[PDB]
Amino acid sequence: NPLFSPYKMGKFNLSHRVVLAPMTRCRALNNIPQAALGEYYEQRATAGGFLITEGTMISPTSAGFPHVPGIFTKEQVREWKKIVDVVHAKGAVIFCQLWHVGRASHEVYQPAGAAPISSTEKPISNRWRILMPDGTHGIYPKPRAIGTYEISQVVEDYRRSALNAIEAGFDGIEIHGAHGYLIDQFLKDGINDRTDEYGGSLANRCKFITQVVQAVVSAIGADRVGVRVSPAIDHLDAMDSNPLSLGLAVVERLNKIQLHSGSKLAYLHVTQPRYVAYGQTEAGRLGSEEEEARLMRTLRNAYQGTFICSGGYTRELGIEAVAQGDADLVSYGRLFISNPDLVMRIKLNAPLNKPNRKTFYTQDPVVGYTDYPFLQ
Amino acid sequence: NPLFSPYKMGKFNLSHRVVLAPMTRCRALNNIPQAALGEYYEQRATAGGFLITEGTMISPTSAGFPHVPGIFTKEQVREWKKIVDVVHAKGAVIFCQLWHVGRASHEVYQPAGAAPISSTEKPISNRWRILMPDGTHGIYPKPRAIGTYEISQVVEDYRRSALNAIEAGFDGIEIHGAHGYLIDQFLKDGINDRTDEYGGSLANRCKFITQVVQAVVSAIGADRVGVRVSPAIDHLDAMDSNPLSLGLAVVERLNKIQLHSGSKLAYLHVTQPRYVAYGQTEAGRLGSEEEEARLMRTLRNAYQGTFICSGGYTRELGIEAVAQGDADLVSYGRLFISNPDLVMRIKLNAPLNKPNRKTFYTQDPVVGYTDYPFLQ
Ligand SMILES: Cc1cc2nc3c(=O)[nH]c(=O)nc-3n(C[C@H](O)[C@H](O)[C@H](O)COP(=O)(O)O)c2cc1C
Ligand SMILES: Cc1cc2nc3c(=O)[nH]c(=O)nc-3n(C[C@H](O)[C@H](O)[C@H](O)COP(=O)(O)O)c2cc1C
């Protein structure tokens, strides 16, 4: 089983290739990590296994979901340390994902009633909604296109949060640069309509992620930094005219940060598009799944380092990704929600619990969170 | 179950509201309807049920898929008659969809390797592919822009094909005016860059569809003519700057044809964009379809007659569409591919077979065509 062949990720001797993908679950009441998160991550931790935490706030204004943890206050750092300790007790490696949602926010998640920040003034279109604290779905407001001088302040929020993650004992951080959130709002030319130095050419649109990555690398070292992107994705109106061109520009700048830093990053983490659009048309799907495979393998061959693939993976698709050399590590999300011992189950090819979508984002510290059964 | 309320479509007393949507399947080898088509439509026919055939060529220049049937020769009429006879023997109503692909073709599909015809010289871009006869995907080429006299010849091709369909025994015809094919290449201001009386204003862009519909109405009668459009679907680079305005402008012209002809069309058939809610993303399952639903309801409210909705419909969505008054009839494509007895399965709320996209457009007369199983 290729998934259980060991993998060296930097200084990390991983015993298997099954990774816990970062997943928002909204159990961090009032944005402070809770003991429930400890039991949750403890359940999924394995000897030599890699975990990535839920997206975590870098500033008071950076959230777009309820009860997501932060790591911008000293109190949050203190509570994360307790979670990290129990994961390390089980011998696992754990990175904290740093998450700014940008224009994907709401007045209820904005402490000063300010408009959410972004590259653009364009709002998320009406077919997307936000989760409200009462469980209802809300409308995304109009964001504010931030000026040049404001870029550095947000970059600084990543740096201070990265230092805070290290203070809490995390083995590293992951930059959430995917899925139409703040960093992806600069990357994608379907969102980024700016005319200043952060807009226009591929090089200009890549400046924000480059400056974010360089700041956290200069703060905690390249070996403790992973980066997540999704060049091709249908999420929150993030589309690009040439996803392949965009992906290789990001890879080329990441490769260059490694060259000048003299150390590789922890990894590149890329979401599988899993294109299913225009399925009701005559020609909309012709050659789509072939374009998608080419996208991923082209990025993988170009990136000089560890490659993690994510999105719609199953036990069979994960085996084949590693077997064909398509990725070094495979992260699982939904199956890891409902199977605390997904790693063991994948080893044994056991039956897999089915996830209950209804409790993905509810606030109960147990129900839908820690009461999915182990193998008996 | 509102889908099994009877519906009166003109003279036709339909016993239920589940419609077979028109679907290209490429089993009509060398453009001649085959016996396999008779078995396929017979499997799906029900007493009082309405069927619409796959897109059918109106001329040697109208195809952009391999082995699609024509109805522009007498040999084709004779073979279609056998299929119509077995469908009528089961008590179903059947219309033949008349299809010209315009610029969505390739030299391999054109007489003497000629360029495809269109409103414009602009090609479909390389984000779309054409299916080639050998099963690979090819590149759409530059079309030739036709002038006023040749437009009138294409209109006559529609008229002659409509007469041929009646000669074969069809209950009527459907004009394929959707999905970025020839008529939509005149409708959509993202495609139509003409400056003559067929380009520019909404009125000019609607001239071609009005001419086509008027010509067939005057040949066989409005009661035997249905019209299909998709103002909000941008398949094959067919975008309009104001889809709802374009949709209402088309509806206006159809209402006017009906008043001047003194009788209603069989129906207006509209395919709507349908956005798959991705489960792998943070907010994919929080989406809203309200905006697309309001577009469809506004077109239906504006049109004086029978409305067929299509695009991503399920059992539950079809029930809701009829129950809320949003449509009179609901057409199903992909689920009708894999469920020959889809009508009965929806009536009983039975499980549905999954369709296999790999055999949507292959040539076998059985495999992936007639060997999907009935309820047992
Ligand atoms: C409930 C849920 C929450 C998620 N939260 C995040 C997140 O906070 N940050 C992130 O980068 N991806 C997030 N994702 C995407 C996952 O990390 C992962 O890419 C996806 O679940 C993998 O596909 P799979 O569920 O088929 O395994 C989330 C996915 C789900 C289903
Ligand atoms: C394989 C396939 C072939 C199709 N061929 C045609 C066609 O020839 N003419 C047409 O107007 N629409 C065609 N369509 C679109 C369907 O008529 C219909 O609008 C769509 O399939 C409905 O969505 P559903 O599959 O979710 O039911 C086709 C769709 C598919 C999947």
Residue numbers in the entry:
A (entry chain A), B (entry chain B): 10 to 385
What does the paper say about this structure?
Jasmonates are phytohormones that are pivotal in mediating plant responses to various biotic and abiotic stresses and regulating plant growth. The first crystal structure of OPR3 from tomato (SlOPR3) showed that the enzyme crystallized as a self-inhibitory dimer in which the L6 loop, a critical loop involved in substrate recognition and coenzyme binding, from each protomer intrudes into the active site cavity of the other protomer.
Variant Y364P was produced to test whether residue Y364 is required for homodimerization, as proposed previously. Even variant Y364P, lacking the putative phosphorylation site, was crystallized as a self-inhibitory homodimer, indicating that Y364 is not required for dimerization. Despite missing a tyrosine residue at position 364 and a sulfate ion, SlOPR3 Y364P can still form the same homodimer, clearly positing against the proposed regulation of OPR3 activity by phosphorylation in vivo. Thus, it seems unlikely that reverse phosphorylation of Y364 serves as a regulation mechanism in vivo.
